[PDB]
């Protein structure tokens, strides 16, 4: 079952024949994507007795949102006996295809809730965003503040990280780390990547399982707050740093400059693996060590954990 392979055929889009349409967006006045914040998209509709297997309807989802969040592939929930199975198209919209249930049922009505997440590429910056979703002529709008908040900082050591592209079938994940986003001077900077202490974590961190790329940021303004990163905007300095794997499930990166200090941010993109023989918990700790001008040794660390949500969908009807 792959989201890269779709199937079509007989049937007609009966979106505009949906009766009793209501749409809603459940969220707070503020959404914090990096604190596992999300919204709920709610939908209700009556289906025409006229409907037959293969007829489709379209739920319009805005580019400011995606449905996959921290995982790499979105699963839209089936409306339930299965009334309708759904799929995500190239625009991000959800096309549902009605089953056989509707070939012999009448007065059919349904409900749907889908978790949705602020998309990092389309909402790169903190700020208000009007979210719009709908079905046919019925659109709902909700204007919300998207707040990506702030990196962590202790003395002259700044760091934050994000996790996405969690793929529980190929056993991989991505982690994107901003090192020194404060634009501090740091001397003898060292980054270590670990499992989060005393927490169930199934990351395998080592030279075979963990691909690390390091980008130098010559213009901090180019950094998104969402942690979307396109490597083409920055300088790839992977080959000039020291990357090693000094302890079980730990990596270490020394920036190793000629004057043994950094004055700019660095982005570290970690493409790693999950332990196939496990529940696949992901709890990580990223630690930035460094001296200040006074040569007192300090570290700041950032923890990454994740949450998972499921939508639902129910439908009733009567034998004709």
């Amino acid at each position, epitope marked *: 079952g792959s989201h890269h392979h779709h199937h079509h055929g007989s049937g007609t889009d009966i979106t505009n024949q949906l009766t009793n349409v209501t749409v809603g967006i459940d969220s707070g006045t503020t959404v914090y994507p990096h604190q596992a914040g999300y919204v709920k998209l709610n939908y209700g509709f009556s289906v025409p007795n006229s409907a037959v297997k293969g007829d489709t309807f379209k739920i319009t989802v805005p580019k400011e949102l995606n449905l996959n969040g921290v995982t790499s592939t979105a699963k839209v929930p089936p409306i339930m006996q299965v009334l309708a199975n759904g799929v995500i198209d190239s625009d991000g919209n959800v096309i549902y295809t009605f089953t056989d249930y509707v070939n012999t049922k009448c007065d059919v009505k349904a409900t749907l809730t889908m978790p949705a997440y602020i998309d990092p590429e389309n909402v790169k910056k903190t700020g208000n965003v009007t979210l719009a979703t709908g079905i046919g002529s019925t659109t709902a709008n909700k204007t919300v503040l998207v707040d990506y908040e702030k990196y962590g900082k202790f003395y002259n050591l700044s760091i934050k990280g994000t996790i996405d592209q969690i793929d529980k079938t190929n056993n991989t994940y991505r982690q994107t780390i901003y090192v020194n986003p404060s634009g501090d001077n740091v001397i*003898a900077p*060292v980054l270590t990547g670990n499992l989060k202490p005393n927490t169930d974590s199934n990351a395998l961190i*080592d*030279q*075979q399982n963990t*691909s*690390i*790329k390091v980008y130098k940021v010559d213009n901090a303004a180019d950094l998104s707050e969402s942690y979307f990163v396109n490597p083409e905007n920055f300088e790839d300095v*992977t*080959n000039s740093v*020291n*990357i*090693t*794997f*000094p*302890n079980p499930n730990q990596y270490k990166v*020394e920036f*190793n*400059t*000629p004057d*043994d200090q950094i004055t700019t941010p660095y982005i570290v993109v970690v493409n790693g693996h999950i332990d196939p023989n496990s529940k696949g918990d992901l709890a990580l700790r990223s630690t930035l*060590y460094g*001296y200040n001008s006074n*040569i007192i*040794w300090r570290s700041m660390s950032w923890d990454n954990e994740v949450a998972f949500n499921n939508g639902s969908g129910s439908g009733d009807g009567i034998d004709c």
Partner: antibody, heavy 121, light 113 residues
């Protein structure tokens, strides 16, 4: 010029603690990590552990329970301590330090002359 | 633990000839992201500390003679002496530094007669 010299006892009983000192010159200990590595008579080399400039230590997993590494930047001294000794800990003990940044890694470029410790009753 | 094994324990050499030594690792020491092989070779004489000859598999250390070269990639590596001299009689150890620090059991050169 960067230098390292190991001093210690020559002989140590198995009831006792091994205590070695590495005296450092030509660089600041707070800016460089120093390694410990050992070599039994007629055998190969074994990394024991390291102390970072900032004071963190990493140990060889097989000896961490019996091993402690510490230092005094003030005095240019690095210390190695080992308890629960057997004849297998009779070895030449070395301290060592990496090359300058352009080497691209933290390894063993500058070595001390080493100091033989033999465990015996 | 990446384990390092050197194939010929002892090697009989003719002063002037081409000596090659093998070293093998139980897992790859080529990290795919930077394409570097985290491998070094050391020389040791009987009462002295080891001396770095070669690092990153093929980068000759300053001061080391041009007759020494290193090759290989991944899990198989070689130390060559173009033509062996009196001072080359010693022990040679390989070593990896990608996953902590480990050494091979070494290869002793002796004179053939």
């Amino acid at each position: 010029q960067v230098q390292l010299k190991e001093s210690g006892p020559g002989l140590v009983k198995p009831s006792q603690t091994l205590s070695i000192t590495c005296t450092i010159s030509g660089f600041s200990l707070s800016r460089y990590s120093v390694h410990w590595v050992r070599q039994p008579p007629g055998k190969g080399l074994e990394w024991l552990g390291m102390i970072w400039g900032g004071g963190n230590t990493d140990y060889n997993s097989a000896l961490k329970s019996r091993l402690s590494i510490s230092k005094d930047n003030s005095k240019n001294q690095v210390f190695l301590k080992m308890n629960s000794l057997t004849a297998a800990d009779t070895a030449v003990y070395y301290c060592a330090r990496k090359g300058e940044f352009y080497y691209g890694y933290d390894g063993f470029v500058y070595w001390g002359q080493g100091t033989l410790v033999t465990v015996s009753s | 633990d990446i384990v390092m094994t050197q194939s010929p324990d002892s090697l009989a050499v003719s002063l002037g000839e081409r000596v090659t030594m093998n070293c093998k690792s139980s897992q790859s020491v080529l990290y795919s992201s930077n394409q570097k092989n985290y491998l070094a070779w050391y020389q040791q004489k009987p009462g002295q500390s080891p001396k770095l000859l070669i690092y990153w598999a093929s980068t000759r250390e300053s001061g080391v003679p041009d007759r020494f070269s290193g090759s290989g990639s991944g899990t198989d590596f070689t130390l060559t002496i173009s033509s062996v001299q009196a001072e080359d009689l010693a022990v040679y150890y390989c070593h990896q530094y990608l996953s902590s620090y480990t050494f091979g059991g070494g290869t002793k050169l002796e004179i053939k007669r």
